[PDB]
Design a protein around this ligand. Structure first.
Ligand SMILES: Cc1cc2nc3c(=O)[nH]c(=O)nc-3n(C[C@H](O)[C@H](O)[C@H](O)COP(=O)(O)OP(=O)(O)OC[C@H]3O[C@@H](n4cnc5c(N)ncnc54)[C@H](O)[C@@H]3O)c2cc1C
Ligand SMILES: Cc1cc2nc3c(=O)[nH]c(=O)nc-3n(C[C@H](O)[C@H](O)[C@H](O)COP(=O)(O)OP(=O)(O)OC[C@H]3O[C@@H](n4cnc5c(N)ncnc54)[C@H](O)[C@@H]3O)c2cc1C
Ligand SMILES: [Cl-]
Ligand SMILES: [Cl-]
Ligand SMILES: [Cl-]
Lengths: 581, 75, 75, 579
C-alpha cells in the first residue's frame, strides 16, 4: 500500500456548470476540495443559455446573482415565442413566453424573488470560476483528466492525468462528485448505464452576428422558429437571440441521412441567409458545431461515496432549457449534505437522499423536454405543410389560411391547438419551480399534498408541504427588503415562526444539543424580527401564527407544524431529517 | 410620459406612524401587485402615471398653440 | 371618492387610537399589535379588514376603466 | 429572562456595528441595542486608514465604502495657511501621497486611505447587518444596568418609546456605548487621564472653496486669521471636494459657546475664509468636549468594552474610529471560538492584552499631535496682543535676507516636520504588533531599526505582527495575502517542500477541534507569487510556515518543514486551551 499524491475531502470531476456550482457551494460552506476539468479552457461556445427563476434563487444563495444579472438578457426581452416563415416574411403564430404574457405575469412575479434571464455558458462559466478563485477554499485544475477510480468503506482513490506533461497522480477523497458531462466516464466506472434512446437526432448550431433588429425588436423573443416555404415540416430553422438583436444562434436538425460539413461556412452562411429571407443582411459566422441529441436518464445517481450530477445523469434536447437549470439544482441539493457528512453530523442515510430527491426530477425534465421537441412539428403540419411541395404551394397555404372557407377554418383550429401545446416549453412554471421531493431529507406532516384541476406542468402552486421549495414572500428586515428565500438557506437550517412561537426556542436549542446541528429560529411578525408588510407570508405559510416551517440549507421545506403544541417533536424530527442512526 | 412619474414608482399604498418610524400596513397600488398586474396590463395600451397640473396644463396649451385651429385668451 | 375618504380613518381606529391618548399610549398600542393576546389577534383582524377596503381607492380598476354607457349615442 | 441570545452588544456606533457585522459573518446570533432612534446625524470621524480598509475587505463591505468615500489622492497635502484666500504658511504630503512615502504606502496594504464620515458609514454597516439576518438591531433601546455570574450576563433594557422594561440574558456582552460608557461604569472601571482638556466647536457647512483648495488638495487646511493668538487656529476639513466642509475652533474655556447662534458661527467662518463673497450655508453646529483617556482595563468577566468606551482622544491622527473597528475585529473571532466551546476565558483575556496597549499608544500620539499644531504659528513669531497688521508683517518678512528671518524659517521647518506624526504616521496606523496574546513567540528578536517607528512601517511575520501584504494571483484572480487568509479561519501559508504541514494541520485539528487550512504559495497548484514579493517578506524558508489568525495577525511562524510537529501544541497555546 502506497500513500496518495493528494488527500482532499471532495474531488469534483468536470468543470461545466454542474461541477463549478458544486465548487462554489463547497467554497461558501468552507469545505476544501479539488476540481479537475479535462479541457484547458471554459466553454468556448454558447451551448445552454436560459436561466430560470429557481437557478436565480440558487445564485442569490451562492452570492453571484448580481454579477450574472449585469451580463444576462433581461426577461422582458424574451417576451414571446414566435413561429414564422422566413425571419423577413409572414409570421405564423405567437404566444407569450417566460411569464411575460398578461395571463402568467402575476403568477411569475408572486412565485420567486428572481426573474428568468439569458446568459450563455461561455459567459456564465468564467463568472463561476472567478467566484471560486476569490473564495480560495478549493483549487481548480483545468487540463487535468480523470482516468479511473476505486472506492472502499472509507474513501475514493482516483487516478488523474496532467494532459500538458502526461504525468499521472492519485487523489484520495472522502467523496467524489461526477460532474463530467454526457458520457460520464465517472458513471461508467460505477457500472450505471443510462435508460433511453441515443443520437435520436443531430443539431447543427451556428453562432453568428447579423443585425436582424428590423425583424425582431417589434416582437422580442428568445426563440423565433421558422420554415422556409418549399421545405418539409421536419426542416425547421430555430433562431436564438443571445444579444438583442445582433448576436444569434441558428439551429437545424438535418435528416439522420445527410452530410453535415461543420467546416463548410459557405453552405451554412447560404442556409442562414435563406432562413432570414433577405439577401441584404450580412452574416458573420463565429462557430459551427454539430451535437448529438439523446434523451436519457440514469436509473441511479450515486454508488457508495460517488455521486453524479448534471449531464452525467440526464441528457435531453434543448427544448425547455431544463438541462443547465437541473445541473445547478443537482449540485445545490448534494453539497450541503456532504458538508454535514464530512463534519460527522450525518452519514450515508442523508447522502442517499440526493438520488431519492433528484432522480425523479431527472425523469421529469427528460420526459418534458422530449414531448416539447415533438410538439414543434405540429405547427407546420397544422398549416398543411408536407414533403414534396413547391415554395409557391406552401406560400399559397399561408395566404389562404385567413380565407372564409371550411378548409381554412379547420387549419386555423389545428394551428391554435398546436400553438397552445407550446406553453409546455414557453410557460412551464410547474416543471421549472413546482417540483416537490416526496422522499428524502424531510418528515411528512400527515397532510395530503396540495392539488387542483390546473395542469401541474404549466402552473406553480406555492406550499410549505414538506419536500416543496419554500414559498417566496417579500419581508422587510428594518428597511432592508428581502425574500423568505434570502433569510433562509446559506448553509444552515432555519425555523420560521410567528406570534406565540416562543416555545420553539427551547425545542430548537434541545434539537441542536441532540444532533449537533444548529437550528436558527427566525420569528416573522414577532420578536423584533423581519416584518411581513403585505401579509403574504401569513397567507402562504399554511400553519398558524404559533406553528413552524423548518427550511433546509437548499431552501426546500424539511418539516412544518400547525401550532406550538408540536414544539416537543423538533429534536426527533431533526434526527430523522439528518437520518442520524 | 417624458415628464410623468412612471407606474412602477407608485407601487404601494403605505400606512405608517412617522415617515422615520414603524409602518402600520401596505397594499399594492395602481395594478403593481402580482394579483392585479396581469389584469392592468391586458386592459389598456397605457399605464398609470403621475403628472401634476402645473406641468400638464402647459403641455395642453403648447399642443393647442401648435395646432393653431382655435385661440386661447388668458386674463 | 366620498366612501374612499371615509375608509382612511378605519386604519388608526383598528389600531385602537382615539382622542386624548399620550404619545407613549399610542407607541404602546403599535408595539403590542404583534403580541399573542386575544386583544392583539382582534386589532390585527380589524386592521386587515380596514386595509382591504383601501383597494377601493388603490386598485379600483372597474371604476377607472369599466364604466359603460347604457343610453346615448349607441344601439 | 425575557430574551436569551449568545452576545448582547450595547451601542450601535462604528465599534458596535463592526461587532454585529463580524458576528453576522461568523454565523453567531446576537442582539444590538442603541439608545438613539437613528444612526449619527453629523459627520464626526471620517478618515479610514489602510488597516480599517483591510478589515472592511475581510467583512465584505470595502467596495460599498469605496464607492462613497473621498479617494486618497484628494487628501494629498496637509496645509498651514493664513486665511483660506490669503498667503499659505507651510505644506507637507499627507496620507502617503508624498513622493518620499508613496512607495511604502502602496507596498504595505491592498487598501488605500479614504474619507467617509460616520453619517454615511453607519448606514452601510446597518444595511450589511440587516441583509445577513443573523443578529437583530434595536434602535431606540437603552441599556440601564447589568449583573454577571460564572455562566452569563443579565442586562436591564428600556424601550424608550413604550417605556417598557425587559431583561436580556447572554453568554457575553460587548460594551460599545461610546464615551462616558454606562457599561464600563457598571464594571467599576475608571478611565485614566484628563477630562474636558478642551472644547471643539465643529460646524458642518457648504461653500464652494475650490478656488482656494483644488490646486493644493488636502483633507486638512489649518488657518490663522492675522491679528489672533496662536491658540485660535481655524481647521477646515474637506468632506466633499470642494463644496462640503467642517470648520473646527477650540474656544478658550472662559468663552461661552452658543451652538444655536448660526449668524455668529457663519461670521467666524467667513473671517476664516478671508473672502466675504463666498456663500456659507450652516448644516449643523456641534460643541464637543475633548478628552485624552484610556481604560487601564478593557474587560471584566464576560463583559468586553470596545472603541470610545475604552479610549478617547483629540481628533488629531484620526485614530479613534480606526481603533474602534480593529477593537471589535480583535474580539469577535475569539468570542465565536469560546461560544463553540473551543476556547475559554484564556483566549478572551487576550482581547485586553492585545488592544489595551494600542489604546495607550493612540491616546499618547493623538495628544502630542494636538500640541504640535501651535508650533506652526509660534515659529512665525505670532503671540497675543498683535494687530492684524503686525502678523501680516511677520508673514511678509519671513522670506527676508536677515538673521531674524533665517531663524524663524528654521523654527517653521522644525514645527512643520513634526506634523508628519499626524499626516504620515504609517508605523502607528499599520505597524503595531501584539507582544502578548493569542500568539506563540518563535524566539527570534523583534525586527528593529533606527527609523522613527511611529512614522515608518516595517512588514514582518514576527508573531503578533499584521501579516505582510503581497499581491498573489489565484489562476487569473489578483488577491492579497490578506484576502486569502482571515475570513473567520486559521490559515497556514507554506511553499515548496511544505507537504509535512498537512499532517501537522490534521493533528492540530484533531487535538484542538479548530481547523487549520494549509495554503501552499508557488507550489501544489496554489496561488502564485508573480513578483516574488511574498518570498521576500515571509522571513521563513520555502518549506516553512506562517500561521495566520482570523484577524490577519500572525499567531506563529516556523523557518522550515523540520518544525511541523510543533503545530498541534502551538495551536493549543494560541487558543489558550486548558491543561
Ligand atoms: C455541443 C453542445 C451544445 C449544447 N447546446 C445546448 C443548448 O442549446 N441548449 C441546452 O439546453 N443545452 C445544451 N447543451 C447541454 C448543456 O451544455 C448542458 O446541459 C449543461 O452544460 C450542463 O452540463 P454539465 O455541467 O452537467 O456538463 P458539461 O457542460 O458538458 O461539463 C462537463 C465538463 O467535464 C469535462 N470532462 C469530461 N470528461 C472528463 C474527465 N475524465 N475529467 C475531467 N473533466 C472531464 C468536460 O471537459 C466538461 O468541461 C449542449 C451540450 C453540448 C455538448
Ligand atoms: C460630538 C462628537 C464629535 C466627534 N467628532 C469627531 C471628529 O471630528 N474626528 C474624530 O476623529 N473623532 C470624532 N469623534 C470620535 C468618534 O466619533 C468616535 O471615535 C467614533 O464614533 C468611535 O465610536 P464608538 O463606536 O466607540 O462609539 P460612538 O460613536 O460614541 O457610539 C456609541 C453608541 O452607543 C450609544 N449608547 C450610549 N449609551 C447607550 C445605552 N445605555 N444603551 C444603548 N446605546 C447606548 C450611543 O447613542 C451611540 O450610538 C466625535 C465624538 C463625539 C462624541
Ligand atoms: Cl482543451
Ligand atoms: Cl448576489
Ligand atoms: Cl468587499
Amino acid at each position: 500500500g502506497t500513500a496518495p499524491d493528494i488527500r482532499v475531502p471532495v474531488l469534483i470531476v468536470g468543470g461545466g456548470p454542474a461541477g463549478l456550482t458544486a465548487a462554489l457551494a463547497l467554497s461558501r460552506y468552507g469545505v476544501p476540495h479539488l476540481l479537475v476539468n479535462r479541457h484547458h479552457g471554459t466553454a468556448h461556445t454558447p451551448r445552454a443559455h436560459l436561466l430560470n427563476q429557481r437557478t436565480g434563487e440558487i445564485f442569490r444563495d451562492l452570492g453571484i446573482a448580481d454579477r450574472v444579472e449585469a451580463h444576462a438578457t433581461p426577461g422582458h426581452l424574451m417576451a414571446n415565442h414566435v413561429f414564422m416563415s422566413t425571419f423577413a416574411g409572414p409570421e405564423v403564430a405567437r404566444i407569450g413566453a417566460y411569464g411575460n404574457g398578461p395571463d402568467r405575469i402575476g403568477e411569475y412575479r408572486a412565485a420567486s424573488p428572481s426573474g428568468l434571464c439569458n446568459l450563455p455558458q461561455h459567459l456564465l462559466e468564467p463568472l463561476l470560476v472567478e467566484a471560486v478563485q476569490e473564495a480560495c477554499v478549493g483549487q481548480l485544475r483545468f487540463g487535468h483528466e480523470f482516468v479511473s477510480l476505486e472506492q472502499d468503506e472509507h474513501g475514493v482513490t482516483s487516478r488523474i492525468t496532467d494532459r500538458r506533461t502526461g504525468r499521472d497522480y492519485t487523489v484520495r477523497s472522502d467523496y467524489l462528485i461526477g460532474a463530467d458531462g454526457a458520457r460520464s466516464r465517472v458513471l461508467a466506472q460505477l457500472g450505471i448505464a443510462l435508460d433511453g434512446a441515443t443520437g435520436i437526432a443531430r443539431a447543427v448550431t451556428t453562432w453568428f452576428e447579423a443585425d436582424l433588429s428590423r425583424y425582431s425588436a417589434h416582437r422580442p423573443a428568445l426563440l423565433y422558429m421558422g420554415a422556409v416555404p418549399g421545405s418539409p415540416p421536419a426542416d425547421g430553422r430555430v433562431f436564438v437571440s443571445l444579444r438583442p438583436w445582433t448576436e444569434w444562434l441558428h439551429l437545424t436538425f438535418p435528416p439522420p441521412t445527410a452530410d453535415v460539413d461543420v467546416e463548410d461556412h459557405e453552405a451554412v452562411r447560404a442556409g442562414i441567409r435563406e432562413s432570414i429571407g433577405d439577401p441584404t443582411v450580412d452574416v458573420t459566422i463565429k462557430n459551427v458545431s454539430a451535437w448529438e441529441v439523446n434523451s436519457a436518464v440514469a436509473p441511479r445517481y450515486a454508488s457508495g461515496r460517488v455521486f453524479c450530477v448534471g449531464d452525467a445523469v440526464h441528457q435531453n434536447p434543448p427544448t425547455n432549457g431544463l438541462g443547465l437549470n437541473s445541473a445547478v439544482a443537482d449540485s445545490f441539493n448534494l453539497c450541503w449534505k456532504l458538508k454535514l457528512a464530512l463534519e460527522g453530523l450525518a452519514g450515508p442515510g442523508l447522502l442517499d437522499t440526493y438520488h431519492d430527491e433528484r432522480q425523479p426530477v431527472g425523469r421529469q425534465i427528460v420526459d418534458r423536454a422530449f414531448r416539447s421537441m415533438v410538439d414543434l412539428i405540429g405547427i407546420p403540419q397544422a398549416l398543411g405543410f408536407t414533403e414534396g411541395q413547391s415554395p409557391e404551394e406552401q406560400w399559397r397555404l399561408l395566404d389562404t389560411l385567413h380565407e372564409d372557407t371550411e378548409e381554412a377554418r379547420q387549419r386555423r383550429a389545428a394551428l391554435a391547438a398546436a400553438t397552445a401545446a407550446i406553453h409546455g416549453q414557453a410557460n412551464a412554471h410547474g416543471v421549472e419551480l413546482g417540483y416537490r421531493y416526496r422522499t428524502g431529507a424531510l418528515v411528512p406532516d400527515g397532510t395530503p399534498e396540495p392539488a387542483d384541476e390546473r395542469d401541474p406542468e404549466l402552473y406553480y402552486r406555492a406550499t410549505t408541504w414538506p419536500g416543496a421549495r419554500l414559498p417566496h414572500a417579500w419581508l422587510e428586515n428594518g428597511r432592508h427588503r428581502c425574500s423568505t428565500l434570502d433569510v433562509t438557506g446559506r448553509g444552515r437550517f432555519t425555523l420560521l415562526t410567528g406570534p406565540g412561537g416562543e416555545p420553539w426556542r427551547d425545542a430548537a436549542r434541545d434539537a441542536a444539543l441532540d444532533t449537533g446541528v444548529e437550528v436558527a429560529v427566525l420569528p416573522i411578525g414577532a420578536g423584533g424580527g423581519p416584518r411581513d408588510p403585505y401579509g403574504t407570508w401569513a397567507e402562504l405559510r399554511e400553519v398558524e401564527e404559533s406553528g413552524a416551517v423548518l427550511v433546509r440549507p437548499d431552501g426546500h421545506v424539511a418539516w412544518r407544524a400547525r401550532d406550538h403544541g408540536h414544539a416537543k417533536e423538533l429534536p426527533e424530527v431533526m434526527a430523522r431529517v439528518l437520518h442520524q442512526p
